[PDB]
Structure 1
Amino acid sequence: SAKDFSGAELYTLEEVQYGKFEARMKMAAASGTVSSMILYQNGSEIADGRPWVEVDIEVLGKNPGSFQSNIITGKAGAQKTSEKHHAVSPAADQAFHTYGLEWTPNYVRWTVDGQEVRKTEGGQVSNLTGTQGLRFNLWSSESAAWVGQFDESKLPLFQFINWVKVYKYTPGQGEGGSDFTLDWTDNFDTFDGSRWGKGDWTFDGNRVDLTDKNIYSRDGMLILALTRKGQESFNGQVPRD
């Protein structure tokens, strides 16, 4: 649209209340970029007084060896946040890792390759009311302090998603008596339009227009691309997981 760069956002058409969410991915990273997996209550961004409900995993480009976790509550223009950082090894853009988010009435948990890196309870959790959809996005932030100055010479960049698993919150009824039960898996052999949407919008602080042109399906993976406007393409080699 009106911006000079093109990014991408894969989002579930449906939203859910609570659950466990896993995504097998190799993230993108260069100074200035944001490569993510998030839970998001659609409409949170509307400043009409309604609450903001969001849980994040965001690889900040200048620091590929870690990701920032966050929970955003409060409301548009007055967000309450809780940014923390977690080391990832090998670096997020150097290997596939399984990223997990668990959201229940009592806590939000973040896992990497099955290991807990963060568990939050309390106020913000009590305010993650309603439903959230699962999304993945690749963009560039104008806050250099947050992600580093944007190095356009590193473009194009790609985030690869091998598969996604979504589990329903079934307290005390999952396997081994756990609290989750697998609901569905998407192996990304194709782009399933009955399950996912491709974003076509932008927001303040984002120097890219999220576009459906930058979501590709190849060799069993879903690819999100960050490119200069007018150079939207993927010709490279899809990595092996």
Structure 2
Amino acid sequence: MKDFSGAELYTLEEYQYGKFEARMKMAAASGTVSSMFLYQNGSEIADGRPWVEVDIEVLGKSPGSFQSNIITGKAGAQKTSEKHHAVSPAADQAFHTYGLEWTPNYVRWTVDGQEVRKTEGGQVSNLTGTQGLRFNLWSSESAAWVGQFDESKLPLFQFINWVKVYKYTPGQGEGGSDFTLDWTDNFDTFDGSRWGKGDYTFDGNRVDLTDKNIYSRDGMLILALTRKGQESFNGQVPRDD
């Protein structure tokens, strides 16, 4: 029913702890949100269950940084911890490898292997259960957060070159480390046994996440943000040199 079309790529499976890395070139225009996040599906339901989510969100008005967040508490009463981190070159101008490391003890955010944030204890202790890995591209109705939405900048595209997912195996990883690679995806194709395409929306989101805006071209998974009725991708995928 909404007038804009966004997209979401999500793992069908959820995991308890792990290390997640994605090689991406984000999308950005005033009013947009381009993300990588861990999400306990169902957190949005206000039936008393806990909210469990860890985010990496590039806010459209500020492509030179991304906002990190941990959402706990419960629907209607979220507990948050927004912080901002510089990305250079800008997130929408080059590929970067974004990483999330989630253990019982801490959550670490990395960009090209460098730590930009590590939260220990506190909210992390409430990230119980499982979370799936997701990526989406949409626009928020909160102008103070993402900027007034500039429709003239559409269409926008977020490119994912590859993903790595590691199992949390404390003390049992390569050389006595804490993680063991589980699977990787180079996105030469859309693997439907591993991923799903989002078809939903939520209050505060001006767009409908639709499977129409997920494309697979030349080694990459593309998420698109377009006006409704103009869902398409015909250009070239950027190079990751």
Q: TM-score range by the shorter chain?
A: over 0.9
> In structure 2, how many angstroms separate the alpha carbons of the residues matched to 1:180 and 1:116?
17
For each residue in 1:186-241, what CA deviation from the matched residue of structure 2 results, as whole angstroms up to 9, or x when unmatched?
A: 00000000000000000000000000000000000000000000000000110114
For each residue in 1:130-150, what CA deviation from the matched residue of structure 2 results, as whole angstroms up to 9, or x when unmatched?
A: 000000000000000000000
For each residue in 1:166-187, what CA deviation from the matched residue of structure 2 results, as whole angstroms up to 9, or x when unmatched?
A: 0000111112322111000000
For each residue in 1:74-116, what CA deviation from the matched residue of structure 2 results, as whole angstroms up to 9, or x when unmatched?
A: 0000000000000000000000000000000000000000000
Q: SS of the counterpart of 1:101?
A: strand
> In structure 2, how many angstroms separate the alpha carbons of the residues matched to 1:228 and 1:173?
48
Q: How many angstroms does 1:122 deviate by? A: 1.6
Partner of 2:204: 205
> In structure 1, how many angstroms separate the alpha carbons of the residues matched to 2:129 and 2:70?
14
Q: How many angstroms does 1:159 deviate by? A: 0.1
Q: SS of the counterpart of 2:124?
A: helix
> In structure 1, how many angstroms separate the alpha carbons of the residues matched to 2:233 and 2:62?
24
Q: How many angstroms does 1:61 deviate by? A: 0.2
Partner of 2:191: 192
> In structure 1, how many angstroms separate the alpha carbons of the residues matched to 2:91 and 2:151?
20
Q: How many angstroms does 1:33 deviate by? A: 0.2
Q: SS of the counterpart of 1:176?
A: helix
> In structure 2, how many angstroms separate the alpha carbons of the residues matched to 1:213 and 1:72?
29
For each residue in 1:49-92, what CA deviation from the matched residue of structure 2 results, as whole angstroms up to 9, or x when unmatched?
A: 00000000000000000000000000000000000000000000
Structure 1 moving runs of 4+ over 6 Å: none
Q: SS of the counterpart of 2:110?
A: strand
Q: SS of the counterpart of 2:51?
A: coil
Q: SS of the counterpart of 2:27?
A: coil
Q: SS of the counterpart of 2:205?
A: coil
TM-score norm. by structure 2 comes to 0.98
Give ranges in structure 1 of 5+ residues lacking alignment: none
Q: SS of the counterpart of 2:123?
A: helix
Q: SS of the counterpart of 1:206?
A: coil
Q: Percent identity?
A: 98
Partner of 2:49: 50
CA RMSD of aligned residues (A): 0.5
Partner of 1:59: 58
Q: SS of the counterpart of 1:216?
A: strand
